[PDB]
Design a protein around this motif. Structure first.
Motif, PDB file in Angstrom:
ATOM      1  N   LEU A  88       0.822  -1.217   0.000  1.00 52.71           N
ATOM      2  CA  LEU A  88       0.000   0.000   0.000  1.00 52.71           C
ATOM      3  C   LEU A  88       0.850   1.259   0.000  1.00 52.71           C
ATOM      4  CD1 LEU A  88      -2.976  -0.946   2.395  1.00 52.71           C
ATOM      5  CD2 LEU A  88      -2.846  -1.209  -0.139  1.00 52.71           C
ATOM      6  N   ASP A  91       2.112   1.445  -3.565  1.00 48.66           N
ATOM      7  CA  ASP A  91       0.985   1.640  -4.499  1.00 48.66           C
ATOM      8  C   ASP A  91       0.452   3.079  -4.414  1.00 48.66           C
ATOM      9  OD1 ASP A  91      -1.459   0.352  -6.181  1.00 48.66           O
ATOM     10  OD2 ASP A  91      -2.314   1.553  -4.523  1.00 48.66           O
ATOM     11  N   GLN A 159       0.593  -5.890 -10.113  1.00 50.84           N
ATOM     12  CA  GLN A 159       0.881  -4.451 -10.133  1.00 50.84           C
ATOM     13  C   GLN A 159       1.467  -4.037 -11.489  1.00 50.84           C
ATOM     14  OE1 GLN A 159      -1.028  -3.314  -7.855  1.00 50.84           O
ATOM     15  NE2 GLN A 159       0.420  -1.955  -6.774  1.00 50.84           N
ATOM     16  N   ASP A 162      -1.371  -3.937 -13.909  1.00 53.14           N
ATOM     17  CA  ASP A 162      -2.161  -2.759 -13.533  1.00 53.14           C
ATOM     18  C   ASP A 162      -1.521  -1.487 -14.145  1.00 53.14           C
ATOM     19  OD1 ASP A 162      -2.186  -0.357 -11.348  1.00 53.14           O
ATOM     20  OD2 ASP A 162      -4.050  -1.494 -10.947  1.00 53.14           O
ATOM     21  N   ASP A 231     -13.588  -3.042  -4.571  1.00 56.31           N
ATOM     22  CA  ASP A 231     -12.614  -1.966  -4.366  1.00 56.31           C
ATOM     23  C   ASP A 231     -12.715  -0.906  -5.482  1.00 56.31           C
ATOM     24  OD1 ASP A 231     -10.167  -0.914  -2.877  1.00 56.31           O
ATOM     25  OD2 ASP A 231      -9.369  -1.085  -4.925  1.00 56.31           O
TER      26      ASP A 231
HETATM   27  O1  LIG Z   1      -6.150   0.752  -2.000  1.00 58.33           O
HETATM   28  P1  LIG Z   1      -6.378   0.812  -3.552  1.00 58.33           P
HETATM   29  O2  LIG Z   1      -5.320   1.869  -3.533  1.00 58.33           O
HETATM   30  O3  LIG Z   1      -7.600   1.257  -3.818  1.00 58.33           O
HETATM   31  C1  LIG Z   1      -5.632  -0.786  -4.174  1.00 58.33           C
HETATM   32  O4  LIG Z   1      -6.740  -1.827  -4.010  1.00 58.33           O
HETATM   33  C2  LIG Z   1      -4.401  -1.071  -3.397  1.00 58.33           C
HETATM   34  C3  LIG Z   1      -3.763  -2.388  -3.922  1.00 58.33           C
HETATM   35  C4  LIG Z   1      -2.328  -2.315  -3.795  1.00 58.33           C
HETATM   36  C5  LIG Z   1      -1.558  -3.430  -4.223  1.00 58.33           C
HETATM   37  C6  LIG Z   1      -2.124  -4.595  -4.752  1.00 58.33           C
HETATM   38  N1  LIG Z   1      -3.478  -4.729  -4.923  1.00 58.33           N
HETATM   39  C7  LIG Z   1      -4.430  -3.663  -4.535  1.00 58.33           C
HETATM   40  P2  LIG Z   1      -5.535  -0.526  -5.968  1.00 58.33           P
HETATM   41  O5  LIG Z   1      -5.298  -1.649  -6.796  1.00 58.33           O
HETATM   42  O6  LIG Z   1      -4.401   0.564  -6.228  1.00 58.33           O
HETATM   43  O7  LIG Z   1      -6.923   0.045  -6.347  1.00 58.33           O
END
Ligand SMILES: O=P(O)(O)C(O)(Cc1cccnc1)P(=O)(O)O
Ligand SMILES: O=P(O)(O)C(O)(Cc1cccnc1)P(=O)(O)O
Ligand SMILES: [Mg+2]
Ligand SMILES: [Mg+2]
Ligand SMILES: [Mg+2]
Ligand SMILES: [Mg+2]
Ligand SMILES: [Mg+2]
Ligand SMILES: [Mg+2]
Lengths: 337, 337
Positions: A88, A91, A159, A162, A231
Motif C-alpha cells: 500500500l 501503491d 501491479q 495494472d 474496491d
Molecule cells: O487501496 P487501492 O489503492 O484502492 C488498491 O486496491 C491497493 C492495492 C495495492 C496493491 C495490490 N493490490 C491492490 P488498488 O489496486 O491501487 O486500487
C-alpha cells in the motif's frame, strides 16, 4: 469469530514493535522503523491478519493451541498485515493517491516523500525478521517463507499488469477488456488478500497437501476477485469517510471494473464522452465519467454482480471446503460481503 | 580469476532471462520483466556476481564442481547482481540521480517514472524465484534464502540511516560525524557488497560454521567500508565516463566521507563556506564546496587512506583467512584496490 479476537490481535502489535525495536549505532533507523510501523500497519480493519488467527484456531486441535502456538499465530497474522502495508505504501506513490485509512498517505507527509520507497522495503524485510524470530524452529518455517515470497511475486506481477494497462496521459479504451481485467485482479489482489492468510494457518496446522491448498485456492481466488471489483466500485461510489481513501482510478487511466462495464454497455456517442474525459486530472472531466457511469446504471449492475458472486462463492464452498471446516470460508465471506 | 570466467557468467544471463520468462495472461508483465532485467542488471562490472563463481571454484573440490553445480553457482551469482539492481533502481529515485552505468537512470526514462518502484520490487522477487528453481533440493537452500533476506534488511537499515542523515534543504553539519559515517557505510554497503557473495559460495561449499562466517565477515566488512569511502570520493572526483554515473552527494546533503573529512580539517571561515553552500542544487554552490575540498587536499587525504586501508585489509587477510584459501580475499582486494 473476528470480533473479540480483534482486541488480543491489536494488543500483540506493541510486542511485535518491541521485538523488532546489532549495537545502538542503528538507533535512529530503529526509531524511523517504529514510526513507519505505527503509521502504516495501524488504522485498517486487520481482516487479513485476523484471518490467520481465526483459521489457526479452527484448524489446530485445542490441545495443540498452547500459549506459544497462539503467539506464533498472532505474529504470522501481523506478517500478513506488514505485506499489505509494504504494497500500500508503494501503491499510493505509484497511483498518486492522497489519503489512506483516514490520514494522508505516508509519502505525502512533509519530510517523507520518496524516502517512503525504502520505508516500504523495510516493512517487507520485517516479515522475514518476524518469521525467523518466532517460527525458525517450526516444521512449517520454509513453507511460510516460500508462501510470503510467492504471494509478493504474484502481487508484483499484478501491479505490473495494472501499471502497463494504465499509461499516464495515454487514453486507449481498446485495452480495457474483460479478459485483461480478470488477469490483473487475479494477480494483484486474489493471492495475497485471502489465499495467503488461510494457507499460512493451514501450514501452521500441518496441512501442507497440494490438493488441499489447490481446493482452498479455488474458493479464495474467486473471493479475491470479488474484493477487487468491490474496491474499484468504492473508488468512485464509496463514502471516503468509510473507505478512508480518495479515489483516483479515473484520473489515473486505470482498467477499473467500472470502465470495463461502461465499455460493454456504452453507445458510440457515450464511448466518445468516455474517450474525451477518461485518464485526466480535471474534476469536471472526472464528473462527466461518473455521470456516464450513473446513466448506464453501473451501481445497480454492481449490486446484481455482488449477489451473483456471493451465490457463486457459496456454491464453491459447498464443492471445495471439505475436509476443512466450512466456517473457515463462511466467516471470511460474511466479513467481505 | 575473474577475467575468462566473466564471459561464461555474462553468457548465462540469457538462460536466467529465459527461465524467468501461469498462463499467457501475464505475457505483457513478463515482457516488462525482461525489459527491466536487460536495462538494470546489464552494463556493470559484475564483480559481486562473479565473486560467487570465483569463490565457489576455490572452495569446492574439483570432483564436486560438476555441470549442475556450476549452473547453480552462476545463478546464485546472478541473484547477487539482481539484489544490487533492486537497490540501485530505488536508490537512484531516492537520490534524484541522472545516470547509471553510462545510461539514463531507469526511472528517468520517458514512460517509466515512479513505476520503477514496482520494477525494483520485481527484481528482488526474481532472486527467490531463481533460488527455488535451481537450489530448492540443495542442503544450503534455506541458508541462501536467509542470507539474501538478511543482506536486504541490513542494506535497508543502512539506506534508512543514509536518508535520515541527509534531510533535503536542511543543512545541519553537526550531524556529519565520523561515528555516524562508519555506522551508515557498515549497513548500507559492507554486508551485501562482499560478505553476501563469499558467504553464498561458502554455504554452497558446505561451509556453514559460525566462526568461519564471522572470520570472513571481519575481512569483508572492512573491504566494504573502503569501497563505500571510494564511492563517495568518486561521486565528486571520479571521471563519469569511467564511473558511468553523475554525482549528487553535495546537492543531496549527504553524510559523505568527503564532508566528514572536510569538517575535521576546516577553519571557522571554511566551515561557514561549507554551511552556506552544502545541500543545494545551484552548480555555483556545488563548485564552491569542491573548491574547498581541493583546498583542504581531500584527494591526497583519500590517496593516503586507500594505502592505509589496503595494508590494514592485508593484515586482516593474514589473521582471519585460514582455513579458507587466501586467494578468495586477495582476488577481491586486487579488483577493488
Ligand atoms: O487501496 P487501492 O489503492 O484502492 C488498491 O486496491 C491497493 C492495492 C495495492 C496493491 C495490490 N493490490 C491492490 P488498488 O489496486 O491501487 O486500487
Ligand atoms: O551508486 P551510488 O548511487 O553512488 C550508491 O553507492 C548506491 C548504493 C545503493 C544502495 C546501497 N548502498 C550504496 P550511494 O550510497 O547512493 O552513494
Ligand atoms: Mg491504489
Ligand atoms: Mg494501484
Ligand atoms: Mg482501489
Ligand atoms: Mg545513490
Ligand atoms: Mg544513496
Ligand atoms: Mg555514491
Amino acid at each position: 469469530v473476528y470480533a473479540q479476537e480483534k482486541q488480543d490481535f491489536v494488543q500483540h502489535f506493541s510486542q511485535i514493535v518491541r521485538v523488532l525495536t546489532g549495537h545502538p549505532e542503528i538507533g535512529d533507523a530503529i526509531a524511523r522503523l517504529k514510526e513507519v510501523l505505527e503509521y502504516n500497519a495501524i488504522g485498517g480493519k486487520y481482516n487479513r491478519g485476523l484471518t490467520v488467527v481465526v483459521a489457526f484456531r479452527e484448524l489446530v486441535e485445542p490441545r495443540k493451541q498452547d500459549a506459544d502456538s497462539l503467539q506464533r499465530a498472532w505474529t504470522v497474522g501481523w506478517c500478513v498485515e506488514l505485506l499489505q502495508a509494504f504494497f500500500l505504501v508503494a501503491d499510493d506513490i505509484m497511483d498518486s493517491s492522497l489519503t489512506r485509512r483516514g490520514q494522508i498517505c505516508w509519502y505525502q507527509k512533509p519530510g517523507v516523500g520518496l524516502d517512503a520507497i525504502n520505508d516500504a522495503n523495510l516493512l517487507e524485510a520485517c516479515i522475514y525478521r518476524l518469521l525467523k524470530l518466532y517460527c525458525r524452529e517450526q516444521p512449517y518455517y520454509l513453507n511460510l517463507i516460500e508462501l510470503f515470497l510467492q504471494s509478493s511475486y504474484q502481487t508484483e506481477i499484478g501491479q505490473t499488469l495494472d501499471l502497463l494497462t494504465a499509461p499516464q496521459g495515454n487514453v486507449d479504451l481498446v485495452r480495457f477488456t474483460e479478459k485483461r481485467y480478470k488477469s490483473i485482479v487475479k494477480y494483484k489482489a486474489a493471492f495475497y488478500s485471502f489465499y495467503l492468510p488461510i494457507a499460512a494457518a493451514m501450514y501452521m496446522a500441518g496441512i501442507d497437501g497440494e490438493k488441499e491448498h489447490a481446493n482452498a485456492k479455488k474458493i479464495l481466488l474467486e473471493m479475491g476477485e470479488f474484493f477487487q471489483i468491490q474496491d474499484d466500485y468504492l473508488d468512485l461510489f464509496g463514502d471516503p469517510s468509510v473507505t478512508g481513501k480518495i479515489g483516483t482510478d479515473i484520473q489515473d487511466n486505470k482498467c477499473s471494473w467500472l470502465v470495463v462495464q461502461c465499455l460493454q454497455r456504452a453507445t458510440p456517442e457515450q464511448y466518445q464522452i468516455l474517450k474525451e474525459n477518461y485518464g485526466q486530472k480535471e474534476a469536471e472531466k472526472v464528473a462527466r465519467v461518473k455521470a456516464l457511469y450513473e446513466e448506464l446504471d453501473l451501481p445497480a449492475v454492481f449490486l446484481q454482480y455482488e449477489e451473483d458472486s456471493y451465490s457463486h462463492i457459496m456454491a464453491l464452498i459447498e464443492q471445495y471446503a471439505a475436509p476443512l471446516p466450512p466456517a473457515v470460508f463462511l466467516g471470511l465471506a460474511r466479513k467481505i460481503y
